[PDB]
Amino acid sequence: ALYKKFKKKLLKSLKRLG
Numbered sequence: 415a416l417y418k419k420f421k422k423k424l425l426k427s428l429k430r431l432g
Contacts, residue, residue, distance in 0.1 A: 426432065 421428075
């Protein structure tokens, strides 16, 4: 597992970016 991490960074971008 690790993609869950990716979502962390993808969550930032997902919505805003910062």
